[PDB]
Amino acid sequence: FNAKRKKKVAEIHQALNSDPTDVAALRRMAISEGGLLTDEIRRKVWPKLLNVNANDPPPISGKNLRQMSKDYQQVLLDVRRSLRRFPPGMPEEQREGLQEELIDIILLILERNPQLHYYQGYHDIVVTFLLVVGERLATSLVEKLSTHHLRDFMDPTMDNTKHILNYLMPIIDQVNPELHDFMQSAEVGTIFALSWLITWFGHVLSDFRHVVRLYDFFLACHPLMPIYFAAVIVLYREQEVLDCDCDMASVHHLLSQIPQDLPYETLISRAGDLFVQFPP
Numbered sequence: 001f002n003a004k005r006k007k008k009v010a011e012i013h014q015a016l017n018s019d020p021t022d023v024a025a026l027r028r029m030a031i032s033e034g035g036l037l038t039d040e041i042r043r044k045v046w047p048k049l050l051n052v053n054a055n056d057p058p059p060i061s062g063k064n065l066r067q068m069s070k071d072y073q074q075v076l077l078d079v080r081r082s083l084r085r086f087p088p089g090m091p092e093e094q095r096e097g098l099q100e101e102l103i104d105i106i107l108l109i110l111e112r113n114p115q116l117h118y119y120q121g122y123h124d125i126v127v128t129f130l131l132v133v134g135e136r137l138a139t140s141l142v143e144k145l146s147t148h149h150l151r152d153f154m155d156p157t158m159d160n161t162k163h164i165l166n167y168l169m170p171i172i173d174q175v176n177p178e179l180h181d182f183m184q185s186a187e188v189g190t191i192f193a194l195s196w197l198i199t200w201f202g203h204v205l206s207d208f209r210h211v212v213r214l215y216d217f218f219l220a221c222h223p224l225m226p227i228y229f230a231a232v233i234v235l236y237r238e239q240e241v242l243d244c245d246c247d248m249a250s251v252h253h254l255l256s257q258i259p260q261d262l263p264y265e266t267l268i269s270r271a272g273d274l275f276v277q278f279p280p
């Protein structure tokens with residue numbers, strides 16, 4: 001509704017202009033329907049959700065960032081194969097400048113944080129931020145995300161099948177023991193969910209506008225929330241899975257193929273509920 005949107009926009013403005021900043025009202029707003037509504041609003045709100053300040057604009061990239069980055073060839077390759085992330089209406093020139101900044105953001109964060117290891121798909125998170133909030137803020141926000149919500153993904157000692165994936169099955173079991181037991185016998189594992197988690201579902205929801213609204217939700221929530229969103233998608237598809245061919249090839253095949261037009265607002269609700277009933 002348009003009356004509701006006007007009220008939500010004024011409530012966001014009231015929260016930004018309060019003392020103290022009413023961050024609690026901003027999480028509520030990010031969690032509730034439509035999330036934060038616009039990128040202009042997100043440029044102000046996302047840094048509050050991650051508790052990052054207007055700060056020393058990241059001690060500049062040193063000179064020769066690219067020349068000293070061992071991951072430059074990998075990052076260049078990943079970024080070049082990411083054109084689909086950009087509005088099809090976006091002029092070629094404008095897009096190629098954003099690709100240049102996307103490379104520099106990733107490389108700068110890696111250089112500032114040598115304990116972090118690049119992974120394929122990281123650029124799907126970084127480009128979303130660059131498109132929403134621009135290059136300086138994308139850098140300081142993603143850096144905060146990289147050292148917290150994404151750290152295990154960027155840790156090569158960390159075994160991603162342990163850790164984050166290890167939550168998915170008990171979650172599904174808590175809510176639907178049949179589906180749990182079914183997927184157990186298919187020996188399907190949890191690897192199917194992994195691409196979703198490390199790219200924050202950029203290839204699960206088609207509409208870029210839906211993806212950014214999901215980032216509102218993830219930024220407002222505890223860092224394990226994406227696993228509950230994965231769980232809720234799997235549970236949504238229960239019938240389709242219970243009608244499957246029961247093996248690691250069938251089960252994988254179906255779940256990996258994402259339905260068009262998922263009810264994201266409903267699934268976002270359900271992920272918050274599930275989070276409450278089976279917390280980390």
Ligand code: BEF
Pocket residue numbers: none
């Ligand atoms: F050009 Be792909 F590496 F098909």
